[PDB]
């Protein structure tokens, strides 16, 4: 039964973290095409004909990269949180699978009695009203 619970839990945390990642992608998505264009223009064979042009293109690339590190480090942070939370969730999931498969115990039997009381209390909450 815990397998069902962890299956419910997976998408919620995954989606929260993915929304965070989408926000980080959003705040820096307008510089990736500029960086790629600068790199491609730098790697052109007909570019080295003016030293000042090389200097200014290198300066532009350096400025873009200086602006781009913060997004990358925030991405590492959120991905690390992703990894640890998902590790915990998978741990719960595969303990649940191993327990459910090892025997095709009185403690988990008691939890049924504890929940049976709640089901009995909620069923009688409509009769008594």
């Amino acid at each position: 039964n815990d397998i069902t619970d962890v299956l419910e839990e997976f998408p919620l945390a995954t989606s929260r973290y993915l929304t965070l990642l989408h926000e980080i992608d959003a705040k820096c998505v307008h510089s990736m095409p500029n960086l790629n264009e600068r790199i491609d223009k730098f790697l052109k064979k007909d570019f080295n004909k003016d030293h000042q042009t090389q200097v200014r293109l290198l300066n532009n690339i350096n400025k873009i990269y200086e602006e781009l590190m913060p997004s990358l480090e925030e991405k590492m942070h959120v991905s690390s949180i992703m990894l640890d939370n998902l590790d915990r969730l998978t741990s719960r999931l595969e303990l649940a699978y191993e327990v459910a498969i090892k025997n095709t115990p009185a403690m988990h039997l008691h939890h049924e009695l504890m929940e049976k009381i709640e089901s009995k209390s909620n069923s009688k909450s409509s009769q008594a009203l």
Binding site: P11, L12, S15, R16, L18, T19, H22, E23, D25, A26, K27, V29, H30
Partner: protein, 382 residues
């Protein structure tokens, strides 16, 4: 003159693709109004999450507006009221009960954590949107964190503490000759309308349910006063208006006034409580009908700012705000909800579209014809 026009599916206008600056802050969604309160800033976070998970960030430049200061708020409000607002806390209200009864805070304007921070961030969002729209750096400012129009010069009512709309209007008026204001909220923009009665610079049009409703003001005879005569139009309606009826009662008025008034800048409130299944609303609009107004206003190629107010059922206001944000970029939406944090809150079908209710419409065509007759008659004077 009112004529029946059946509603048609919305298609974007590829003539213009103006820049969109969607102002947003991540701390607005933390504030809460109470336990049983209907007004929730959490809907702004819902809409932002829907936008983020939908793939709309590649087109629009997302910002984070700096909170406004007290001196900026004093451009329209009184020093005493803003001082009380800053000083009041959810703990020392007993010592501030005199101002609370005097400034009408506590009944529909509950004091909560970071209330002054909420007002400051909304005012700053509107201020920065107006600043961007004034410097030519942008043409559309989606300040979804604002939309607070019920607040007055020295009073706070209708969950509305700081009137950011009039502050943004003043910023536009810094260098613009004439500005125009639109409303779509079911209630009436009492504060924004009142702020510019005697002057020609600002016009305040509101499509507000009239009669025994919350604002209780804004009849057809609210022509103006002094030199601001005929420069504040009102379109009172009744319960149960639909998409086609709203379009037919909305578009001709705007066309006529911008023919006559000739605005140099535009602001558009986008109240989300005028939809089907709303908690505090009495309309039957859908997301297509809601987005029709913003698409129509944008189609005229004028500098416009979209603010966000109202909305008391999460799914409806979130979907409507997402649709409006998408259509402001001249992009039709997928109309399928991607999985996110709040996927469980989006109905039992998990579809972006929300079906409008079947409830009986009340607006008779002849009443609407007479209403727009008076509107056009008073607008023809100038």
């Amino acid at each position: 003159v009112y004529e029946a026009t059946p509603f048609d599916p919305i298609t974007v206008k590829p003539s213009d693709k103006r820049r969109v600056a969607y102002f947003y802050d991540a701390d607005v969604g933390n504030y809460a109004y109470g336990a049983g309160h209907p007004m929730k800033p959490h809907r702004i976070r819902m809409a932002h999450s829907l936008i983020m998970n939908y793939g709309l960030y590649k087109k629009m430049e997302i910002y984070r507006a700096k909170p406004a200061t007290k001196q900026e708020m004093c451009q329209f409000h009184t020093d005493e009221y803003i001082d009380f607002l800053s000083r009041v806390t959810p703990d020392n209200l007993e010592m501030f009960k005199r101002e609370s009864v005097k400034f009408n805070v506590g009944d529909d304007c509950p004091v909560f954590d970071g209330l002054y921070e909420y007002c400051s961030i909304s005012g700053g969002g509107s201020m920065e949107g107006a600043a961007r729209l004034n410097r030519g750096k942008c043409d559309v400012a989606v300040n979804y964190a604002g939309g607070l129009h019920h607040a007055k010069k020295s009073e706070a009512s209708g969950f509305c503490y700081l009137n950011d709309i009039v502050l943004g209007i003043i910023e536009l008026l810094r260098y613009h000759p004439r500005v125009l204001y639109i409303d779509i909220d079911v209630h009436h923009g009492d504060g924004v309308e009142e702020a510019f009665y005697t002057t020609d610079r600002v016009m305040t049009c509101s499509f507000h349910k009239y009669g025994e409703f919350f604002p209780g003001t804004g009849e057809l005879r609210d022509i103006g006063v002094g030199a601001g005569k005929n420069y504040a139009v009102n379109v009172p309606l009744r319960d149960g208006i639909d998409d086609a009826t709203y379009r037919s009662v909305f578009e001709p008025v705007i066309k006529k006034i911008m023919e006559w008034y000739q605005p140099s800048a535009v602001v558009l409130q986008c109240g989300g409580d005028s939809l089907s299944g709303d908690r505090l609303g009495c309309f039957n609009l859908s997301m297509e009908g809601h987005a029709n107004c913003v698409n129509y206003v944008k189609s005229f190629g004028i500098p416009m700012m979209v603010v966000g107010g109202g909305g008391y059922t999460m799914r409806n206001v979130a979907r409507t705000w997402c649709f409006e944000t998408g259509l402001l970029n001249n992009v039709v939406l997928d109309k399928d909800l991607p999985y996110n944090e709040y996927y469980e809150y989006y109905g039992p079908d998990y579809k972006l579209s929300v079906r409008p209710s079947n409830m009986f419409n009340v607006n008779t065509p002849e009443y609407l014809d007479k209403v727009m007759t008076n509107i056009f008659a008073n607008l023809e004077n100038t």
